[PDB]
Amino acid sequence: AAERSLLTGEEGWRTYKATGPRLSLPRLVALLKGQGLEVGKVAEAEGGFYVDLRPEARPEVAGLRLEPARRVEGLL
Ligand code: NA
Ligand code: NA
Ligand code: NA
Ligand SMILES: [Zn+2]
Numbered sequence: 001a002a003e004r005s006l007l008t009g010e011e012g013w014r015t016y017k018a019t020g021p022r023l024s025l026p027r028l029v030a031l032l033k034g035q036g037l038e039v040g041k042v043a044e045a046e047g048g049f050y051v052d053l054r055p056e057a058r059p060e061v062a063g064l065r066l067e068p069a070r071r072v073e074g075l076l
Contacts, residue, residue: 014068016051040054
């Protein structure tokens, strides 16, 4: 019952949505690596990026907003 990436289906990942100012893919990755996180698949989202991190990680990156992505969303 391992957590699986919402991007790729691979087990061992939790997909987050990342947003931030002048956020680019290299900057995002660099900021995560700077927190000592293993980074899995990263892909562009609408308004930011999706990024896979290990389920056990507790990502708090300054100025950067990271929330777990949901598999589905409603019309709110
Ligand atoms: Na399995
Ligand atoms: Na684009
Ligand atoms: Na765009
Ligand atoms: Zn857009």
